[PDB]
Design a protein around this ligand. Structure first.
Ligand code: ATP
Ligand code: ATP
Lengths: 520, 519
């Protein structure tokens, strides 16, 4: 049904319409490339304002209606776990590949020759990256050059003023939850929380689990050195339901009887913590005033009003289990911790619970601070980009010089190997060499320099001067050769940037018909 | 003021047929470029806003739904093509409209459509006898085993692909997967799963049923994987402590029943776990997610549990284990339980995967893909599904013909030579029927990006010299012998595609007036 009111696009003009749907996405994000990338204003659906230039926030928030532009949204679900640094880089690469393919479509070449020709030239550019890559941590492990490379990818944003102490934190967080010889870094084992107030220098590395809940009473001790934590859902008190107790009393004969019936329950379940051997009582609900007076005398602290996901996040790090009531209390499901402390922040009444193990754990949490809440969500993503580069260093310590140095040397090898291809895929190989030069050309355009004058000077430098590649001066430094300026990208991040860009042009050029049924 | 129609849509004559011939070509234009293994895919979006990316001709016509009357006559032929042979909807849709295109100038000159009906019944009946003469039975030719021949046809079908370098490993796995099945071959029995990460060498072939196992809840360090004869249970019940469907809310104002209220809510979970313990099910498979409390139950009772299983993988497990899918828990007994010989939790690809091996009804398999992208594995899944299809038809039908337009250019040469010896109105129509059959080697050159006129002029010159099995090549930009290059197709599907394309072309020509009732 519904044949009337249906948009159709077929013929040769549907091929250029899919190019124009992809050219609108690339031209917006060719200005936000590099550390000198221009900011983007985001207007929320309810009226909030948040400004950023990150690539992963652009693709997730751009409510596009074209299905060709919706295919550009799909690459962000798999790229942020792989490269983390070239989200703006693959969009301009997929767009500029279709720019020269728009010129190739005027000649009459079929897109199944262009999609196969782009896959042919991508294997030459991938092979050229492995020949020019240099190692860092071959045959040994070291933590000193890993912080220097992490200082460059972190300081590309506004958090460059405190990039030193935050780069040492992300190195020790990955090395605790994961080993370098195992090469299995888990992103779910590293959590990042934050609260308003303070500076960026007050970032502390908590090896364990943090929850934003205080103790059940202000007279509770703030130091638990014993590794026995009972995590339950019902507090050690007379039993109350989940929503509303609503105890009915008739007269003073029922109030006197229910008080003695509650005084037995106030004496039993409080002393039921000592028969098992637990010290901390993390319960989902709070405690009463009569229970808090008894917890002070027996030296047993407790955490009140712990939320839904806050319970399960503690028991994974400490190795505990969600206990439903007091009858299932065993010593095997009790949590383990080295230091449970409460840390306040000035006059703020947050008083979060800091559970530390004081050892090499398997779940580490990072608490960042700042003067505004928009900087805390920016610094969380800033450390998340730093976690992927260290993850790429563990899987492969070989690295390649970024900042346009790897892109120009790849364009020289592809154009040299294009003459050895005596078929109709030769024009697609020369198309791949021209689109590879656009990413270092957009780097110099965002820096305020002439884009063509800056590009061809490195062409005479990477050929006539020296065979090692030289970078493009993007941060207005003294000279070229960004290897001396310590701006180096990863090899896996540069190989998958080429492969994902070829994958999206192959899926776009093969699509030649769209049918959109409207309303009836 | 007295009208005979009064809203009745009706017209007859010659231009009613010309309006029906040109309306047939809009359906062929929707599946013109999807012909061939290197064809272009179409983008179809439904009313919900979900974009579907596929190049299969059966999936395109099922989502087109054109309200034209002559367009609906090409739908049920594609439906009958799935019942007669199993596939070939994009071949009979393109071939039906090109029969009407060549006779479209002949109708306008005053020729009656019933004479074109008598020519389509004649030349198709000659095409049935001509196919069976050239079709050779290759069963034990040149004393080579059939396992070596089945790896050769899958090598050409998987050529010029992502796994074209390692095609020697992928050709040996698609043969043993069909060899693991019974005599009743089916494409639905062999499932394909994808595992992200790793190189292409780490692809494995599961002899039984393996699923994704997205169960990411608790339950580590217990529940041992190795079981000799476990009882496979297929459930659809949620085993969480605080479930969205299984709860108990009673509003009393007594403190004595408040302990019993939480105990009664736990007894909903506990009695549903105790019935699995009485039935003896060593492995627990459920569609709904399983909580962390139920994982502690089977840990001490020496059993395994794994939730978040899709219902498609549960039905493949039912066909493998031979049991039945039970939604409730009180009806769980040995009549619906399964059995297998080897069950283990593997760590292939970094994630946990469960698979059974050694079932009494082990007629299903699972193919595991490894690669750096899911869209790399998505096109590999469709290419390996195409590699299974060529292997499966070679086992069922031994009498095969050369594909790649070799049987289409040979039928175009014989029907042209028969038309020169027939006087009357059957010369210009059957001679146009032979030229209309040349659209299969022509669209194979168009979708592959080759020169469509440079190959087809050399292909007909090769058939004029005596070449009977020469066609187009998808790898090389020249003609090649498809019988020597193991590009085959059975004779029965080529016959049934011709009698379906001629019947679809005859139903359009025999229609001259359209009757519409006003309602
Ligand atoms: N100091 C520098 N000098 C020159 N080039 C640099 C410098 N720092 C980074 N680059 C280049 O900028 C590129 C990253 O650009 P950009 O900052 O626009 O993406 P991103 O925002 O990091 O991506 P994401 O959105 O995933 O964080 C890298 O490929 C790198 O080569
Ligand atoms: N490996 C191959 N090399 C050359 N030609 C091939 C190859 N595989 C198939 N063909 C040709 O492609 C044509 C069919 O193309 P395609 O696979 O797109 O349709 P199909 O799915 O076979 O259609 P249907 O489902 O109706 O059978 C056949 O006529 C066959 O001759």
């Amino acid at each position: 049904k519904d044949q009337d009111r249906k948009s159709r696009l077929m013929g040769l003009e549907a091929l250029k319409s899919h190019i124009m749907a992809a050219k609108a996405v690339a031209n917006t994000m060719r200005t936000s490339l590099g550390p000198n990338g221009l900011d983007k204003m985001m207007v929320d659906k309810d009226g909030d304002v948040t400004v950023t230039n990150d690539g992963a926030t652009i693709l997730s928030m751009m409510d596009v209606d074209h299905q060709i532009a919706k295919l550009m949204v799909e690459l962000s679900k798999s790229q942020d776990d792989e490269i983390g640094d070239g989200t703006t880089g693959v969009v301009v690469l997929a767009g500029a590949l279709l720019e020269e393919a728009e010129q190739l479509l005027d000649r009459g070449i079929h897109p199944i020759r262009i999609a196969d020709g782009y896959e042919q030239a991508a294997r030459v550019a991938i092979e050229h990256l492995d020949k020019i890559s240099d190692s860092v941590l071959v045959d040994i492990k070291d933590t000193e050059p890993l912080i220097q490379t992490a200082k460059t990818t972190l300081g590309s944003k506004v958090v460059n003023s405190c990039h030193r102490q935050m780069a040492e934190i992300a190195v020790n967080a990955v090395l605790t939850v994961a080993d370098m010889e195992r090469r299995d870094v888990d992103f779910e084992l590293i959590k990042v929380e934050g609260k308003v107030g303070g500076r960026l220098e007050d970032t502390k590395l908590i090896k364990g689990v943090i929850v934003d809940k205080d103790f059940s009473h202000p007279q509770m001790p703030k130091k638990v050195e014993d590794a026995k934590i009972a995590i339950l859902t019902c507090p050690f008190e007379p039993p109350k339901p989940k929503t509303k107790h609503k105890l009915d009393v008739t007269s003073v004969e029922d109030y006197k009887a229910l008080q003695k019936y509650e005084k037995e329950k106030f004496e039993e379940m409080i002393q039921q913590i000592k028969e098992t051997g637990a010290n901390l009582a993390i319960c989902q609900w709070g405690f009463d005033d009569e229970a808090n007076h008894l917890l002070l005398q027996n030296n047993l602290p407790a955490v009140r009003w712990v939320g839904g996901p806050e319970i399960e996040l503690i028991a994974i790090a400490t190795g505990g289990r969600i206990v439903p009531r007091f009858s299932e209390l065993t010593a095997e499901k009790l949590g383990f911790a080295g230091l449970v402390q409460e840390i306040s922040f000035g006059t703020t009444k947050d008083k979060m619970l800091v559970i530390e193990q004081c050892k090499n754990s398997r779940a580490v949490t990072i608490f960042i601070r700042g003067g505004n809440k928009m900087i805390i969500e920016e610094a969380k993503r800033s450390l998340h980009d730093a976690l992927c580069v260290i993850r790429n260093l563990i899987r492969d310590n070989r690295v390649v010089y970024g900042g346009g140095a790897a892109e120009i040397s790849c364009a020289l090898a592809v154009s040299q190997e294009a003459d050895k291809c005596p078929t109709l895929e030769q024009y697609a190989m020369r198309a791949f060499a021209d689109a590879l030069e656009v990413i270092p050309m957009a780097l110099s355009e965002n820096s305020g320099m002439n884009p063509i004058q800056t590009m061809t000077e490195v062409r005479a430098r990477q050929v006539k001067e020296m065979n090692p590649a030289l970078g493009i001066d993007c941060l207005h430094k003294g000279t070229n050769d960004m290897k001396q300026q310590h701006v180096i990208e990863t090899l896996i991040g540069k190989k998958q940037q080429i492969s994902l860009a070829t994958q999206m042009v192959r899926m776009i050029l093969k699509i030649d018909d769209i049918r959109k049924p409207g309303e009836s | 003021v007295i009208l005979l129609k009064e809203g009745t849509d009706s017209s007859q004559g010659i231009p009613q047929l010309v309006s029906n011939i040109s309306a047939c070509q809009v359906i062929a234009e929707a599946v013109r470029t999807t012909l061939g293994p290197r064809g272009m895919d179409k983008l179809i979006v439904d009313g919900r806003g979900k974009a579907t990316i596929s190049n299969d001709g059966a999936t395109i016509l099922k989502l087109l739904d054109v309200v034209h009357p002559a367009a609906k006559t090409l739908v049920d032929i594609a439906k009958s093509q799935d019942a007669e042979v199993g596939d070939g909807t994009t071949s009979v849709t393109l071939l039906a409209a090109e029969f009407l295109k060549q006779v479209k100038p002949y109708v306008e000159e005053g020729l009656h459509p019933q004479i074109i009906i008598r020519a389509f019944r004649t030349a198709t009946q000659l095409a049935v006898n001509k196919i069976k003469e050239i079709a050779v039975t290759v069963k034990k030719a040149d004393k080579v085993e059939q396992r070596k021949l089945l790896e050769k046809c899958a090598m050409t079908a998987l050529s010029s692909k992502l796994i074209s370098q390692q095609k020697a490993f992928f050709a040996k796995m698609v043969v043993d997967a069909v060899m693991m099945l019974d005599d009743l071959l089916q494409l639905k029995m062999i499932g394909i799963k994808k595992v992200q990460g790793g190189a292409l060498e780490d692809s494995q072939l599961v002899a039984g049923v393996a699923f994704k196992k997205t169960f990411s809840y608790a339950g580590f360090e217990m529940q041992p994987k190795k079981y000799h004869n476990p009882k496979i249970a297929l459930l659809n019940v949620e085993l969480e402590l605080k479930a969205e469907k299984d709860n108990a809310e009673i509003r009393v104002h007594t403190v004595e029943d408040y302990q019993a209220i939480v105990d009664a809510e736990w007894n909903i979970l506990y009695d549903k776990l105790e019935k699995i313990h009485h039935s003896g099910a060593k492995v627990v498979s459920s569609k709904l997610p399983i909580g962390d409390v139920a994982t502690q139950y089977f840990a001490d009772r020496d059993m395994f549990c794994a939730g978040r299983v899709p219902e498609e993988d549960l039905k493949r497990t039912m066909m493998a284990c031979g049991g039945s899918i039970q939604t409730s828990v009180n009806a769980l007994s040995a009549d619906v339980l399964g059995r297998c010989q080897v069950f283990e939790e593997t760590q292939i690809g970094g994630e946990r995967y469960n698979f059974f091996t050694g079932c009494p009804k082990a007629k299903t398999c699972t193919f595991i893909l490894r690669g750096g992208a899911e869209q790399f594995m998505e096109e590999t899944e469709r290419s390996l599904h195409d590699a299974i299809m060529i292997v499966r038809r070679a086992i069922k039908n031994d009498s095969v013909v050369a594909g790649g337009g070799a049987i289409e250019m040979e039928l175009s040469k014989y029907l042209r030579d028969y038309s020169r010896t027939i006087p009357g109105k059957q010369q210009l129509l059957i001679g146009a029927y032979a030229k209309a059959l040349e659209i299969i080697p022509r669209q194979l050159c168009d979708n592959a990006g080759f020169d469509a006129t440079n190959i087809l002029n050399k292909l007909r010159a090769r058939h004029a010299q005596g070449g009977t099995w020469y066609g187009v090549d998808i790898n090389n930009e020249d003609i090649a012998d498809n019988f020597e290059a193991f590009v085959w197709e059975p004779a029965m599907v080529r016959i049934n595609a011709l009698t379906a394309a001629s019947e679809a072309a005859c139903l359009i020509v025999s229609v001259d007036e359209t009757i519409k009732n006003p309602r």
